[PDB]
Amino acid sequence: SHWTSKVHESVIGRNPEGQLGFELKGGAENGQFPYLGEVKPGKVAYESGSKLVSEELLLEVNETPVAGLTIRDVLAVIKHCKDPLRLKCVKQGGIVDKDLRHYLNLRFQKGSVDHELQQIIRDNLYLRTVPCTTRPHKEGEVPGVDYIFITVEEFMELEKSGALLESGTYEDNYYGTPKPPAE
């Protein structure tokens, strides 16, 4: 069954203090989906509809996709949304896990809901990251901006440490996307 089979929309308000009722954890800087902390009963101000378990992955806020962004960016999206907040979330378990590296290696059927979400998440991560490659710099490119130009040795150290969320190969070189900085 689909990665997105347990996806649902829960609707919440912020409390008087402007807080959600739960903490946000994870984020691309940690190589993760944004996901909820503990959801204690009573602490969240729901409007009618579906409710949240602890540690659900957060995919969208008010139809802005946030999976693949850093926690800072997620909080920035939330700060510019008006109540009520519509959260698209999915509980962890089975194939659904907060690890972005594992997720971005999953292969979904072209055109599926699962595939479309994975593309949206990749687009989000790409907004926040400079890719690395082992291919040499060419005329017109800016190191640090278009690519981080690194050696194979360096690229494999990053792979080994889990610092690359996505990688591939093309014409005899390695390409990948590192975790974005926290800030």
Partner: peptide
């Protein structure tokens, strides 16, 4: 954002 070569390297 990403170039054609990058997207061909990683897309599956």
């Amino acid at each position: 954002i990403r170039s054609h070569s990058y997207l061909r390297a990683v897309s599956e």
